[PDB]
């Protein structure tokens, strides 16, 4: 199976309140496992997945020390970018980075990420090939020229096939038992009266993990993908997720309609009838 | 482990 290690970085200025808020959030596959937040009472790297306790004091020190370095760097980045864009000193701005690697079971790098955003807009990213950059405007092009002078892509590539891979391997070695965790969706169908004459049945998927799921409504064999109303998957806040999907039907033959739930933690897709 | 970030 493939696996990924990704970091989600965020630095937000706030002039008139002191230091920019800096954060580093860590992800194995889609599960947050580490977190640094500059605003916490004691701004250190903290575990976010039980299985990270098994890392001794040196790990957390090393990572904390590095965040503080990264924090400093970004603190400056926000000013440079202010200049690049010839912006006032007043208001608050955001830099965001996604950084990390996707590697196969054979330990080869499938994909490497290093993407940047300023104020919610693409700024610059390392291309699929890991050697060239895509800048999204004239400010980003200044960064681009500096990085080519400095040999940044090559460096990243070194980290992405080396460092990134080896830490993921360990991170998997540590909490592999836990990351398999699936919680099967418990499903029910609810009936709702409407005006006019028609009715809408709403198909629920409750208490499932991870969030990937699929809900489909079908009239006795053929699925309706144009009349279906759905909500975005949402957390219950207990660890599990929820989603529903509804459809408008004529009154009398609501039994003719079947709901289908597809989730990786289910031996068989659930097929529900009202 | 997160990379040491380059300056933009």
């Amino acid at each position: 199976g493939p696996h990924s290690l990704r970091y989600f970085v965020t630095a937000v200025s706030r002039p008139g309140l002191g230091e920019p808020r800096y954060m580093e959030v860590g992800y194995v596959d889609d599960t947050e496992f580490v977190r640094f937040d500059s605003d916490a009472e004691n701004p250190r790297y903290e575990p976010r997945a039980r299985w990270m306790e098994q890392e001794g004091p040196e790990y957390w020190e090393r990572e904390t020390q590095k965040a503080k370095g990264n924090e400093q760097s970004f603190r400056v980045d926000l000013r440079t970018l202010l200049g690049y864009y010839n912006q006032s000193k007043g208001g608050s701005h955001t830099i965001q980075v996604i950084s990390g690697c996707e590697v196969g079971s054979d330990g080869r790098l499938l994909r490497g990420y290093q993407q940047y955003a300023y104020d919610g807009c693409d700024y610059i990213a390392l291309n699929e090939d890991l050697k060239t950059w895509t800048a999204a405007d004239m400010a980003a092009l200044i960064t681009k020229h500096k990085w080519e002078q400095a040999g940044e892509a090559e460096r990243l590539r070194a980290y992405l096939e080396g460092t990134c891979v080896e830490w993921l391997r360990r991170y998997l070695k540590n909490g592999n038992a836990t990351l398999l965790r699936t919680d099967s969706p418990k499903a029910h169908v609810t009936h709702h009266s409407r005006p006019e004459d028609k009715v809408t049945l709403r198909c629920w998927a409750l208490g499932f993990y991870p969030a990937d799921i699929t809900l489909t409504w079908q009239l006795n064999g053929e699925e309706l993908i144009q009349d279906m109303e759905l909500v975005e998957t949402r957390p219950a806040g207990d660890g599990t997720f929820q989603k529903w999907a509804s459809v408008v039907v004529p009154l009398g033959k609501e039994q003719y309609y079947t709901c289908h739930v597809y989730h990786q933690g289910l031996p068989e897709p659930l097929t529900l009838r009202w | 482990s997160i990379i040491n970030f380059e300056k933009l």
Partner: antibody, heavy 120, light 107 residues
Framework: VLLQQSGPELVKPGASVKIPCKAS????????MDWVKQSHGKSLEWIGD????????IYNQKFKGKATLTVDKSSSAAYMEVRSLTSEDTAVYYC??????????????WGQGTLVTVSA | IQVTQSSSSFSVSLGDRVTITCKAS??????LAWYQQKPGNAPRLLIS???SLETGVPDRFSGSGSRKDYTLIITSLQTEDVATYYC?????????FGAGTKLELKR
């Protein structure tokens, strides 16, 4: 390319000193200014750098609070202030320049270095 | 990331082949530089990126190594090579130097 520093400084325990570094022979604003400390005991140690366009600073966690970096963009000049001096601060302080702009490089040019002696 | 030079001083003869080791505490991926320094002067850049000879530096200076083990080579020690030598990594920040290897003439 040339980075000119001041001559020897004799200073007293508890006091502080400010070392200048005047740069010439290149576009000041396209580079940063790094500072390095050399002393019996720890040899060469990094310290920090300054951005000449906005005075943005990065410090070695080891020197945070012990050193302050400033820039005069217009006279192409960088200054370091080492505060609350101990005998452990007695050393030669270099300013230096990477061959390009970035966090990860080597130092292609050095100032002549300024010896600082802490004594009462 | 600690950079370690084992030998702090080294006795040498003119014409010798001299090898100065530099040991990194983590893989530094060839991001290593070498400086030469003579008394009362600032360090002078000899080599960057592990094997790359800086302009002006004489041809008798050479670099090699991988991962976390690097060497500075001087194939035939001339008299003005009597100096102290420093290696400096830049794979991670803060940039960190070794403690130097000081050469001295045998007699």
């Amino acid at each position: 390319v040339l980075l000119q520093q001041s001559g020897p400084e004799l200073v007293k325990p508890g006091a502080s000193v400010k070392i200048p570094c005047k740069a010439s022979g290149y576009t000041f604003t396209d580079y940063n200014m790094d500072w390095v400390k050399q002393s019996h005991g720890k040899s060469l140690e990094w310290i920090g750098d300054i951005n000449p366009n906005n005075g943005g600073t990065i410090y070695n966690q080891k020197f945070k609070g012990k050193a302050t970096l400033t820039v005069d963009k217009s006279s192409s000049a960088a200054y370091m202030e080492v505060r609350s001096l101990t005998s452990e601060d007695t050393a030669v302080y270099y300013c230096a320049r990477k061959p390009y702009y970035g966090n990860f490089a080597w130092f292609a040019y050095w100032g002549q270095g300024t010896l600082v002696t802490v004594s009462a | 990331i600690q950079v370690t030079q084992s030998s702090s001083s080294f006795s040498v003869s003119l014409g010798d082949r001299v090898t100065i080791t530099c040991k990194a505490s983590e893989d530094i991926y060839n991001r290593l530089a070498w400086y030469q320094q003579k008394p009362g002067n600032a360090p002078r850049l000899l080599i960057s990126g592990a094997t790359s000879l800086e302009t002006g530096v004489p041809d008798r200076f050479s670099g090699s190594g991988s991962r976390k083990d690097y060497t500075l080579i001087i194939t035939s020690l001339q008299t003005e090579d009597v100096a102290t030598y420093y290696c400096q990594q830049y794979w991670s920040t803060p940039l960190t130097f070794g403690a130097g290897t000081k050469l001295e003439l045998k007699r």
